[PDB]
Amino acid sequence: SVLTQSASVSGSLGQSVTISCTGPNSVCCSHKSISWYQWPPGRAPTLIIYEDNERAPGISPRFSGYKSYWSAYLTISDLRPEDETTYYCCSYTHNSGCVFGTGTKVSVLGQSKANPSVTLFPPSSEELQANKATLVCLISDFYPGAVTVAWKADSSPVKAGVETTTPSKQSNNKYAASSYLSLTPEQWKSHRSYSCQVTHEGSTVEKTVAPTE
Amino acid sequence: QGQLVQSGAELKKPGASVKISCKTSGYRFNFYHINWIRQTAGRGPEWMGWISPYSGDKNLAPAFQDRVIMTTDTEVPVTSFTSTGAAYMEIRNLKFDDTGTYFCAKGLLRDGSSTWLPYLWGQGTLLTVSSASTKGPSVFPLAPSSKSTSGGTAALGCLVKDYFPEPVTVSWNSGALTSGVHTFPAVLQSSGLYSLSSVVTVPSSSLGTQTYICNVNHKPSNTKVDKRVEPKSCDKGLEVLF
Amino acid sequence: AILKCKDKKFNGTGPCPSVSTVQCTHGIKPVVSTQLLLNGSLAEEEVM
Amino acid sequence: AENLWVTVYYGVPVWKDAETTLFCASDAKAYETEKHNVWATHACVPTDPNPQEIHLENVTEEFNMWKNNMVEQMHTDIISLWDQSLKPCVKLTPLCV
Amino acid sequence: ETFRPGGGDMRDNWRSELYKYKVVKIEPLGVAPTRCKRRV
Amino acid sequence: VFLGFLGAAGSTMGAASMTLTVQARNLLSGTVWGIKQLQARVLAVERYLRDQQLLGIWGCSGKLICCTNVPWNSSWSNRNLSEIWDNMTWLQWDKEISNYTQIIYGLLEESQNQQEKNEQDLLALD
Amino acid sequence: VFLGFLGAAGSTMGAASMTLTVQARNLLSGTVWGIKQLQARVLAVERYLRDQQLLGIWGCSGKLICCTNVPWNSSWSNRNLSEIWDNMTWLQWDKEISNYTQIIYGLLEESQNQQEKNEQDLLALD
Ligand SMILES: *[C@@H]1O[C@H](CO)[C@@H](O[C@@H]2O[C@H](CO)[C@@H](O[C@@H]3O[C@H](CO[C@H]4O[C@H](CO[C@H]5O[C@H](CO)[C@@H](O)[C@H](O)[C@@H]5O)[C@@H](O)[C@H](O[C@H]5O[C@H](CO)[C@@H](O)[C@H](O)[C@@H]5O)[C@@H]4O)[C@@H](O)[C@H](O[C@H]4O[C@H](CO)[C@@H](O)[C@H](O)[C@@H]4O)[C@@H]3O)[C@H](O)[C@H]2NC(C)=O)[C@H](O)[C@H]1NC(C)=O
Ligand SMILES: *[C@@H]1O[C@H](CO)[C@@H](O[C@@H]2O[C@H](CO)[C@@H](O[C@@H]3O[C@H](CO)[C@@H](O)[C@H](O)[C@@H]3O)[C@H](O)[C@H]2NC(C)=O)[C@H](O)[C@H]1NC(C)=O
Ligand SMILES: *[C@@H]1O[C@H](CO)[C@@H](O[C@@H]2O[C@H](CO)[C@@H](O)[C@H](O)[C@H]2NC(C)=O)[C@H](O)[C@H]1NC(C)=O
Ligand SMILES: *[C@@H]1O[C@H](CO)[C@@H](O)[C@H](O)[C@H]1NC(C)=O
Ligand SMILES: *[C@@H]1O[C@H](CO)[C@@H](O)[C@H](O)[C@H]1NC(C)=O
Ligand SMILES: *[C@@H]1O[C@H](CO)[C@@H](O)[C@H](O)[C@H]1NC(C)=O
Ligand SMILES: *[C@@H]1O[C@H](CO)[C@@H](O)[C@H](O)[C@H]1NC(C)=O
Ligand SMILES: *[C@@H]1O[C@H](CO)[C@@H](O)[C@H](O)[C@H]1NC(C)=O
Numbered sequence: 001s002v003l004t005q006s007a008s009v010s011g012s013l014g015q016s017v018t019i020s021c022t023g024p025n026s027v028c029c030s031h032k033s034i035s036w037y038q039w040p041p042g043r044a045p046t047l048i049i050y051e052d053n054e055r056a057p058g059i060s061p062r063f064s065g066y067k068s069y070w071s072a073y074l075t076i077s078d079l080r081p082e083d084e085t086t087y088y089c090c091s092y093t094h095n096s097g098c099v100f101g102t103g104t105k106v107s108v109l110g111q112s113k114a115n116p117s118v119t120l121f122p123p124s125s126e127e128l129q130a131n132k133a134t135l136v137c138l139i140s141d142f143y144p145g146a147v148t149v150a151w152k153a154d155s156s157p158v159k160a161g162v163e164t165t166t167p168s169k170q171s172n173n174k175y176a177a178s179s180y181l182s183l184t185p186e187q188w189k190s191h192r193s194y195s196c197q198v199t200h201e202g203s204t205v206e207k208t209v210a211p212t213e
Numbered sequence: 214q215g216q217l218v219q220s221g222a223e224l225k226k227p228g229a230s231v232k233i234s235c236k237t238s239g240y241r242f243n244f245y246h247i248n249w250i251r252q253t254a255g256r257g258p259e260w261m262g263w264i265s266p267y268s269g270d271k272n273l274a275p276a277f278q279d280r281v282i283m284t285t286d287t288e289v290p291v292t293s294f295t296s297t298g299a300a301y302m303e304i305r306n307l308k309f310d311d312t313g314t315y316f317c318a319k320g321l322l323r324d325g326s327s328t329w330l331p332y333l334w335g336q337g338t339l340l341t342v343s344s345a346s347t348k349g350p351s352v353f354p355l356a357p358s359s360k361s362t363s364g365g366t367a368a369l370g371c372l373v374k375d376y377f378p379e380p381v382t383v384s385w386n387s388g389a390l391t392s393g394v395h396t397f398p399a400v401l402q403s404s405g406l407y408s409l410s411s412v413v414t415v416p417s418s419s420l421g422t423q424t425y426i427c428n429v430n431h432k433p434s435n436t437k438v439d440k441r442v443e444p445k446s447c448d449k450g451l452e453v454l455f
Numbered sequence: 456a457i458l459k460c461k462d463k464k465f466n467g468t469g470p471c472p473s474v475s476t477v478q479c480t481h482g483i484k485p486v487v488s489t490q491l492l493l494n495g496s497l498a499e500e501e502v503m
Numbered sequence: 504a505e506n507l508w509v510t511v512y513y514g515v516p517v518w519k520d521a522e523t524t525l526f527c528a529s530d531a532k533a534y535e536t537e538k539h540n541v542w543a544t545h546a547c548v549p550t551d552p553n554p555q556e557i558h559l560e561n562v563t564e565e566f567n568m569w570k571n572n573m574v575e576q577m578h579t580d581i582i583s584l585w586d587q588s589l590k591p592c593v594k595l596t597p598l599c600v
Numbered sequence: 601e602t603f604r605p606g607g608g609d610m611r612d613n614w615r616s617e618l619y620k621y622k623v624v625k626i627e628p629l630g631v632a633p634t635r636c637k638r639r640v
Numbered sequence: 641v642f643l644g645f646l647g648a649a650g651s652t653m654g655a656a657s658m659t660l661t662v663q664a665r666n667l668l669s670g671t672v673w674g675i676k677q678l679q680a681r682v683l684a685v686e687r688y689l690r691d692q693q694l695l696g697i698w699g700c701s702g703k704l705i706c707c708t709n710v711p712w713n714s715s716w717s718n719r720n721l722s723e724i725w726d727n728m729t730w731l732q733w734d735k736e737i738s739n740y741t742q743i744i745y746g747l748l749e750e751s752q753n754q755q756e757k758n759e760q761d762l763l764a765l766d
Numbered sequence: 767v768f769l770g771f772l773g774a775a776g777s778t779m780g781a782a783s784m785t786l787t788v789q790a791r792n793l794l795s796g797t798v799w800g801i802k803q804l805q806a807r808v809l810a811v812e813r814y815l816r817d818q819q820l821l822g823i824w825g826c827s828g829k830l831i832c833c834t835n836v837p838w839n840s841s842w843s844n845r846n847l848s849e850i851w852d853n854m855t856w857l858q859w860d861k862e863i864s865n866y867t868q869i870i871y872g873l874l875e876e877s878q879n880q881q882e883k884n885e886q887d888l889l890a891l892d
Pocket of ligand 2: 494
């Protein structure tokens, strides 16, 4: 994109945070208007600021805008846990259309830690008559959203059929994920147990199911 | 202060066309523009264009200047200040980079320097461009597990494995059980098929006082599956409570 | 003022898309009759 | 500045449904029909030679032909019209022989 | 369904011509806010 | 452009404010059945002078537009400047403030020109 | 405080001058036997415009209060400023000046705005 924002910016709770949004003179900012949108991944965006410094209807006064001759800014005072998301800006006029920026991922610091809730599910009886075997490793309620998943076959590393999804933000201002291990019906009945290790901030949690029982 | 509803997600092969609708209600359809904005995982958010139902004037981006057609129906009056309408858009010459979510948005004001500005948005319609055919999902019941022995809580659900394309909606008891329901995103396998999981946290004391029926819906294949999740668990850490 | 509904299809009740205002209505002849309406205003397109 | 202030506007397009006393109008050629005042047209106002009809763009107003008062007014007009036209007429009281 | 000719009430005869008209009153007095203040 | 009487009825308040001198012009317009129009045209001038009296007792007199020294209470449908004149019609606007119309009128006739003009009598004697 | 219509009738002129916007408000108020009120409400607006015409041809137009460039003749009941506004009611006052009311009216419509406005036409051309 021709409109460049800040890659990443942070801010503590009860404090403020500034997001940059600049680019060439052809898009910013002389004789140009700047708007802002709260756009959560996978959800519908919400108009916050329109016409440089005017707030959209129903928008809390915690948001404020400011445009210079070379760049525009967005200050979010009194940070909330539900403000940790992606924010896009738009350069437009009365005639021309919208030219969105690169995007800004805002991380809210000063938040409380949250231990992840892991639950491992064994292959169902209907899948054993197919016959297949799929281990389901669900991860939820962890902050920040950055975890790694490793699998082991009877206390022995697994490098085949290992896949893990990207951490997705929930509705309770927390993150979630899911990992899956593709195995053969023979390996399920040849191993004493299977585990699902999840590492987060040095601390590694692990859940284990056993086909032997 | 209204509502924008679009059509369901469709699957189209590259080279073909697709028509996404957008029905409105709760306001005057002709008093505001209808913007169309898409978002891919390679080009980011992109504004395609808008159209004024009053006049019929259109303004497309140079990128969509030669393969996108926008049409709107006439306004159907409900009250003196509100009405119902529908806006369409037709994108031709589909490619692999056209895969993403497409939104339709209502204008902000009637007059001023920001009349066409997207204010009210719809729910969006997912568009997948692939040569792969539609494959039905395989729903498997998830045996209840122990979440808290001292708390007396548990967790059961269903397993949607191997389906194409996205998305898949899962409800419980025809939309009766919504509390404690956690639906996780799917995984992109090496074969190109997706697979997600749904689980609802419920107390262990509930057995013969509530029926657990997970409702998995896959419209692209026109198939619905209603699985009866067995309340009898196999977790040894939960069997103590029973 | 007197408002006038100018849509070709209107059952006399409900919201009107094309509304116009006038000071005086058109020439309405007070023809007293029953069963058969005589010398009245013709409808537009399909009969109403 | 940022704090707003009220301002009185006179001549704004604002109307509400109501009922009033309507008067008549019937061309100028209709008055030339004379014949000692036929029907009603006696002291009726001549119709404007060039009537104006303003199309209210973007306006959607709800009508109700079954709850319209112009009918109840017209009906009471034609009835009263009938009585006034028979007042100076010959009474056939001694025709019941 | 069977349909038969009716009438009686002559008020119906006027409704066939007054269906496209209705009476409204003009209220030109409207107040509205703006960043405008008078003198002292 | 001249849309005519009640022309900008479906237009925004800001746009309809240009057509104020049009609805004001056609507002006055210059044996039984003849008394039908008499009693009607008598009510016509009474309706006119009624609004003119209010327009006079307020800080206006001069028609069309005039400002006043009354702060806009937020309880009277808190909208923004650009959300009223560029996103709302006079018909749609009068529907919301209808609840507070009688209240605002009192703050114009009583609080203003009764306290403002009396204030001027003190300022004009010196 | 709002005593209502004709409230400060027994109050001093200075005190009753605060109730001017009250008597002015209820002054216009918005087959036989029905013609009884018609001929009455017609005289009502004629009585209103009559005073409004006098109020207009004088150096006033703007209602309630206005000043004029006419010296108060001592022959018109020579009272002091504090003896009029703080020791006399409007009813009691109108009883004395009633003899010179018609005289004063002539000095307002003729001597002023006919000579004042014409004077302004000479001052506005330069
Ligand atoms: C009834 O209701 C309707 C709907 O509510 C309402 O219509 C709205 O009216 C308002 C004005 O009151 C409109 O708001 C304005 O819109 C102006 C139009 O934008 C211009 O730019 C368009 C895009 O041009 C690009 O694309 C073309 C390719 O298509 C390309 O060639 C160009 O080079 C350029 O890249 C252009 O298409 C458009 O042209 C239309 O209009 C002209 C007349 O001007 C007409 O001849 C054409 O045929 C075509 O229909 C137009 O030129 C916009 O400029 C304007 O912004 C200026 O004005 C505001 C003040 O209003 C200033 O503050 C600002 O700084 C700018 O100077 C403003 O945004 C709105 O768009 C209408 N539509 C809606 C809301 O959907 C009616 O007015 C109502 N009528 C009544 C009687 O009530
Ligand atoms: C009975 O119905 C017939 C319809 O078949 C009536 O004849 C039509 O009368 C109308 C006028 O009321 C004519 O409309 C005129 O058209 C010309 C064409 O330019 C236009 O310039 C005029 O201003 C007017 O609109 C119409 O032409 C005519 N139809 C035909 C075929 O000539 C007839 O008048 C009705 N009789 C009544 C109501 O007593
Ligand atoms: C006159 O036509 C209107 C259409 O504008 C009818 O209104 C609709 O009526 C149907 C059922 O008859 C309802 O389902 C719709 O919801 C109505 N629409 C609106 C906007 O109200 C109306 O019913 C018709 N009247 C008669 C007597 O047939
Ligand atoms: C209202 O509009 C003004 C424009 O002058 C803007 O500064 C202000 O932030 C807006 N307020 C809200 C609540 O939208
Ligand atoms: C504004 O309205 C509120 C009612 O919500 C009222 O309590 C308040 O007194 C009003 N403001 C003034 C200045 O009267
Ligand atoms: C005005 O008041 C009535 C009841 O007094 C209420 O029903 C209505 O919603 C109010 N108007 C608005 C715009 O809220
Ligand atoms: C004042 O009144 C007296 C009558 O007592 C009269 O003679 C005199 O001319 C008046 N003054 C003026 C300036 O006219
Ligand atoms: C007014 O004049 C009459 C006679 O013209 C006289 O009797 C009366 O006393 C005068 N008024 C006053 C207050 O003197």
